[PDB]
Write a protein that binds this ligand. Structure first.
Ligand SMILES: *[C@@H]1O[C@H](CO)[C@@H](O[C@@H]2O[C@H](CO)[C@@H](O[C@@H]3O[C@H](CO)[C@@H](O)[C@H](O)[C@@H]3O)[C@H](O)[C@H]2NC(C)=O)[C@H](O)[C@H]1NC(C)=O
Ligand SMILES: *[C@@H]1O[C@H](CO)[C@@H](O[C@@H]2O[C@H](CO)[C@@H](O[C@@H]3O[C@H](CO)[C@@H](O)[C@H](O)[C@@H]3O)[C@H](O)[C@H]2NC(C)=O)[C@H](O)[C@H]1NC(C)=O
Ligand SMILES: *[C@@H]1O[C@H](CO)[C@@H](O[C@@H]2O[C@H](CO)[C@@H](O[C@@H]3O[C@H](CO)[C@@H](O)[C@H](O)[C@@H]3O)[C@H](O)[C@H]2NC(C)=O)[C@H](O)[C@H]1NC(C)=O
Ligand SMILES: *[C@@H]1O[C@H](CO)[C@@H](O[C@@H]2O[C@H](CO)[C@@H](O)[C@H](O)[C@H]2NC(C)=O)[C@H](O)[C@H]1NC(C)=O
Ligand SMILES: *[C@@H]1O[C@H](CO)[C@@H](O[C@@H]2O[C@H](CO)[C@@H](O)[C@H](O)[C@H]2NC(C)=O)[C@H](O)[C@H]1NC(C)=O
Ligand SMILES: *[C@@H]1O[C@H](CO)[C@@H](O[C@@H]2O[C@H](CO)[C@@H](O)[C@H](O)[C@H]2NC(C)=O)[C@H](O)[C@H]1NC(C)=O
Ligand code: NAG
Ligand code: NAG
Ligand code: NAG
Ligand code: NAG
Ligand code: NAG
Ligand code: NAG
Lengths: 176, 324, 324, 176, 324, 176
């Protein structure tokens, strides 16, 4: 079920992120803002609508039909039809209710895994270059401008570059 | 003032849409999707581009035998299904019976071509009386008359000579033929109408071999008539012939119908009227247009339909949990 | 002695309960839950507060016609379902037949009100003999007699004048009427019993139009009788009348039954006896009280039941894996 | 399927923890003991009994019924009823057996995720203040009394407090 | 040359097999598994070690009554199902009818023991003519003859004395008996063949009570014959007796069949021939041997079969995603 | 759904690993090679074939059968049989298609979890003794021979042993 965190280590969602489903919020001296992970959002939009279409498309046997044609001395046969009609309704009714329930459980934790896989993509790029605040944010030890911000958003951040500047800020925070 | 930051997160919006889950109920969510079809157009429509046969105030039987109030007809000659009112007022004006009615209706529910034709004309009963076979039970223009597609033969002079007639179906098409027999009420009526007191009606094709005899007895009045008329039918194949013989009580065919059947359907009971639409799936309270896999409108569908369930919602989550 | 610690963990207990999983079998677990209902109370019960009609050693026919060993009756007048033994010993004492028996039983399976009434009394057959219509096949107090609710009329003096009688249903309720015809064995018996050699029984309502004729032939003995009695029935609507006519072989109605039907049910075959309980779901081997969605007791349920399966367990895990 | 560990990185369950389903075992100089995560256990008890109730409640079409009414010359029609009866029994039988199997798989890994989410709640609170033994335990670098023990059990542990005391014990373990 | 390493990974191979998934299509994978059975052996086989009864160019009726071209018979005496051609050429040589044919066929679909026996021999009709009951509709060796297991009795001298015969089943087994009645075409033929103009056929057991009367009427020719022959059947229980009586138009039993039934089956329509195999599940186009849960070969199975679906593949992944 | 990585942080699969389904590839001065996690692979082979067999074996109601026996004036009853026949075909067809789809989704992420659980077993054993390259590999800070390589493959790696030679190579990489 729950992967790390939707309503877990990340209480709440960005009411203000409006260009996608999962993404990043930054703040530096240049400013702050939301920016959705275009590629990651499209994966999920595809998977989800693929799920819904499958549930619809696999029925792909609708067939052909009728009502009510036995007479007053054929009540036994009509009762047979009643039982059959009711029996199918009971079967389809149950299968659909449970399908919906079960498949909703799984759609929600799908989103959960998508997010957690994003935390992890970023986390494994920076490391001792930033603090895991643990609320879903990273505090940079070095200074990270907008050109830098975009370099993590697209999986091309340069660790060997900033290590220099960071080890130094750890030796500043452990002193006066 | 402080250090730089970047957070990972997920979106949210003003959606109030709720969803359920095996483990949780009433969970708010970004977007959702009902897969349960719940609407119909409130109309009786064509079924894949074929108009249904909507008998208005007529039963199939009234219509076929030509009850005087049903011959306000002009139609058809092709249909996808039939729709009857629950209690159509013009059935058998003269009370009685149509044998295998239910199977006949089923046969006629979807017909590819249908055409009335004169099969034996009234002017081929020279020794019997054709124009007197009429009843107050079964009136037209205030004047009393009878089923128009069949002939209530009675005696001419004081005689009912024995009938031996036959008809050979020389058409391409199967044809549907109806005749009947009249059950009189007592010795006097039977003599008054037919002379001969002990009568029969026999009918043969390559398949059919029937012999009918009137039950002369007392029955309670229906449409003010204790008499009773039982009708029967067959499908005479092309190149076969039907053979009639009777010395009394014969209700003889005049018109018959050419039929070609290729497809099955059924009879819908509905009080509605033609809505000049088209559908793939019709119900008695309206037509349904959707590709959704389930519906809850009505169990008596005719067409290619979603699957009927007892449910008010089938809501699938597409989005994520939506927080305060 | 060493450093401080904190572990995260989960519980475990001495449960032996096992569960299965698409990928694993026989997995031990903390708590579990069978959703398959497997028990019943071993009793025939009321169905939603209505007692069933338990014919003991009688068939529906024996019971309705009033076979002298079934009028151990006094009842009912309402029931939810009927229960018959597999082979009830008292059916038709005088051998024969009840037409549309199976449909009649179905009609009678669940009845909202049922009341025997005298419809035509034995003292309204002044010119025929009522008290001699009796048989050794069909004995009561050692003395031989007959179905109590119907009358085997025979000739008086040396005459069977033609009967024309009618009865108008003046009640609020539909009523169920039964009559019959007697098939004699040879010309002598028929004359000895009825005088007239060529006889009939005709019956009419607004709906019914029947005419019955005895087959005089040789048949093998049943209950020491080669004779045969065929019965028939109809439902006479309020304000309609039934019209009987016969010059011989008539088994005439004396009592009939008021019925009101609103609900359907069926006939249960079971050897059990009333258990003074109530249930929503009855089986022939006992009643089931549960909200579980499946069961495996018996396929011939009557009521609102779980769904029958071929299964011995449907065990759902609620707890966790339980380790050694 | 398996999230990190039930029968994974945590061989076995606390036979001695009896107040809940998931929780913590501590040891310090004041003593040792089990204490269940009340809040986390209630979530799972709710989810699980909700699952069971749904499987029951969605059937919510039981309907109405019969046995055996056709005669010796209506064998064809009775055989039709047989086929129908059997057909429904085959359908319900399969759907129930697989429902159970599938939903048990998922009930078990639900528990797995719940536990792993607890390890992670604690892990993201302490960090370099304790060693991830990797058997599901944390060895505190600093000294953690019962008031401290409860502060992690309820998500209010004070990291900024015990740094240094820890840094100090790392400089002790890396020497002789 | 550089630092040492250890990678975690998973395997891959040359597999092109593809699989689908609620969220993804056409996903390549290591190993997979179709659970949809798609193959059959193209043969008509025994069903659990019992050979079916394959009528070649005969209908069940032709076969039973002993149509002269079906008595290419010698068999059986046990079978699991029956197979008929779609349009077997030898049905009722003399045109007519076999009552409750469909129910009879059903009864006969699976039979545990079957044996023809002489029930009443042709030399026990001393006052009637046995060897003249023959027709051009129904020819054997160029010479015209008749159904071999039944006897078309006609008048001897200028007389058809009234027949009263009876037969007591003294066997262990139920036995299946067929007789019939002949419908002549006019007063002359009926007199020419039977003398007596007003005739009947009556038949009684402990259960059966029938009386048949020829309909003398005009019918269209079938196999050059306007006459018509209606047959009937019963199962005479051990120790019961059948009673025949007729003064004309009787088609009398000579042979009858011992039957024991314990098991139900049905009739397969197929043009194939016995393939000397054995199966648990047979279809009209071939037999299926599998433990797979679904199949798509053919809906009209007889046996213990997988479940029929409209599907071309049901492929389950067992391996992992396979990359280039 | 996706746990960390099959086609995620681990780009593709070892075409050359042929002794199992999941495992490790090493390189040191003694050489290089693939070696499957025998124990982990057998778990999955068992689970998977158990899944397939269950799907087959639970049908365990096949029953008994027929074709087409009503006549030209019993068309209403035949239509009843049609409806029933079609109805069951629609039910089985849908249930099978979705079963397959749903259960394939779950089979694939089962494999995903199995792998990710292996990354994690190793990751929690080494730590600052190796760099998380983030493509599924670890670069050892110390030198790790074949006897050492096997010690991680079987969960007995000795951290306290090399945690030193490593500290030393971190003070080399943070300089010329
Ligand atoms: C209903 O229709 C026709 C009457 O025109 C009958 O079929 C026709 O039968 C005639 C002879 O009976 C066939 O004649 C053909 O040419 C000569 C001339 O008589 C004849 O010697 C040959 O034997 C040949 O068949 C004719 O083919 C046939 N017509 C068609 C269009 O098939 C038919 O028998 C009548 N049906 C009944 C049931 O009485
Ligand atoms: C069976 O019996 C009932 C009566 O017991 C019949 O119904 C009754 O029919 C009469 C006329 O036949 C109705 O007469 C009423 O009285 C005044 C007197 O002049 C008349 O002017 C009114 O217009 C009115 O018709 C009576 O109301 C009616 N009562 C009931 C309860 O139906 C019935 O027709 C009989 N059926 C047969 C088949 O004999
Ligand atoms: C067909 O034939 C058989 C035998 O010929 C008939 O069954 C026989 O019925 C008699 C009495 O009806 C049985 O009675 C036995 O002997 C004396 C007779 O006085 C009786 O008092 C004894 O108590 C004893 O039961 C006899 O057992 C029985 N025979 C056999 C071999 O079963 C049968 O009735 C005939 N069917 C018809 C329709 O006539
Ligand atoms: C991926 O991220 C990097 C870093 O933000 C982007 O690199 C910049 O690309 C532009 C446009 O060609 C160059 O002029 C800049 O000098 C680059 N910046 C840095 C810091 O190297 C790159 O454009 C991104 N790719 C996409 C498709 O958005
Ligand atoms: C969580 O645990 C802490 C202890 O770790 C609890 O703190 C105590 O609260 C009361 C205030 O009413 C003080 O008098 C105690 O001295 C506190 N303990 C310490 C160590 O300061 C706290 O109550 C718990 N929080 C919740 C929400 O239950
Ligand atoms: C796990 O890995 C270690 C790696 O060394 C194995 O240790 C070796 O085992 C063999 C065979 O018993 C000995 O002969 C070697 O000398 C061992 N070498 C060292 C350095 O200890 C160990 O056997 C493995 N354990 C298991 C249970 O398979
Ligand atoms: C447990 C629970 O929350 N139940 C409620 C229910 O009472 C209400 O009628 C419905 C409509 O919004 O929403 C949900
Ligand atoms: C695969 C397996 O081990 N199945 C077993 C079964 O064989 C055994 O009879 C039962 C004992 O109670 O428990 C389970
Ligand atoms: C969504 C998608 O990729 N669909 C394709 C499909 O169109 C094609 O016909 C099939 C045959 O190989 O393979 C897959
Ligand atoms: C049915 O509704 C759809 C949209 O839901 C519409 O596109 C279509 O035109 C409608 N079909 C017909 C036959 O009118
Ligand atoms: C069903 O069982 C419960 C006991 O748990 C009881 O309250 C109820 O009365 C039972 N119903 C009937 C009809 O016996
Ligand atoms: C059917 O195939 C199975 C294995 O799938 C085999 O064991 C058996 O021999 C086959 N049946 C026949 C009749 O040959």
């Amino acid at each position: 079920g729950l992967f790390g965190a939707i309503a877990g280590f990340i209480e709440g969602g960005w009411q203000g992120m409006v260009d996608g489903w999962y993404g990043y919020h930054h703040s530096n001296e240049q400013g702050s803002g939301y920016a959705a992970d275009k590629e990651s959002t499209q994966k999920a939009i595809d998977g989800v609508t693929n799920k819904v279409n499958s549930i619809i498309d696999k029925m792909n046997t609708q067939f052909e039909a009728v009502g009510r044609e036995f007479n007053n001395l054929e009540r036994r046969i009509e009762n047979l039809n009643k039982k059959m009609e009711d029996g199918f309704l009971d079967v389809w009714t149950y299968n659909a209710e449970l399908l919906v329930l079960m498949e909703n459980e799984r759609t929600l934790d799908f989103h959960d895994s998508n997010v957690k896989n994003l935390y992890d993509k970023v986390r494994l790029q920076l490391r001792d270059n930033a603090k895991e605040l643990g609320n879903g944010c990273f505090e940079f030890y070095h200074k990270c401008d907008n050109e830098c911000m975009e370099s993590v958003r697209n999986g091309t951040y340069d660790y060997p570059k900033y290590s220099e500047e960071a080890i130094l800020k750890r030796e500043e925070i452990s002193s006066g | 003032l402080g250090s730089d930051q970047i957070c990972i997160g997920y979106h949210a919006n003003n959606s109030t849409k709720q969803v359920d889950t095996i483990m949780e109920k009433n969970v708010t969510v970004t977007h959702a999707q009902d897969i349960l079809e719940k609407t119909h157009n409130g109309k009786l429509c064509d079924l894949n581009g074929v108009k249904p046969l909507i008998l208005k105030d007529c039963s199939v039987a009234g219509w076929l035998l030509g009850n005087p109030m049903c011959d306000e007809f002009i139609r058809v000659p092709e249909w996808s299904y039939i729709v009857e009112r629950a209690n159509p007022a013009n059935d058998l004006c003269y009370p009685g019976t149509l044998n295998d009615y239910e199977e006949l209706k089923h046969l006629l529910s979807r017909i590819n071509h249908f055409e009335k034709t004169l099969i034996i004309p009234r002017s081929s009963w020279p020794n019997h009386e054709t124009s007197l076979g009429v009843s107050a039970a079964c009136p037209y223009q205030g004047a009393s008359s009878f089923f128009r597609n069949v002939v209530w033969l009675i005696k001419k002079n004081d005689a009912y000579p024995t009938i031996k007639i036959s008809y050979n179906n020389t058409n391409r098409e199967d044809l549907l033929i109806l005749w009947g027999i009249h059950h009189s009420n007592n010795a006097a009526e039977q003599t008054n109408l037919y002379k001969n007191p002990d009568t029969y009606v026999s009918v043969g094709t390559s398949t059919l071999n029937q012999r009918l005899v009137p039950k002369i007895a007392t029955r309670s009045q229906v449409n003010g008539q204790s008499g009773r008329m039982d009708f029967f039918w067959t499908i005479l194949k092309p190149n076969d012939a039907i053979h009639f013989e009777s010395n009394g009580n014969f209700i003889a065919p005049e018109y018959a119908y050419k039929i070609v059947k290729k497809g099955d359907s059924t009879i819908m009971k509905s009080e509605m009227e033609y809505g000049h639409c088209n559908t793939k799936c019709q119900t008695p309270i309206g037509a349904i247009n959707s590709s959704m896999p389930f519906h809850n409108i009505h169990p008596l569908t005719i067409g290619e339909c979603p699957k009927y369930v007892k449910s008010n919602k089938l809501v699938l989550a597409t989005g994520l949990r939506n927080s305060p």
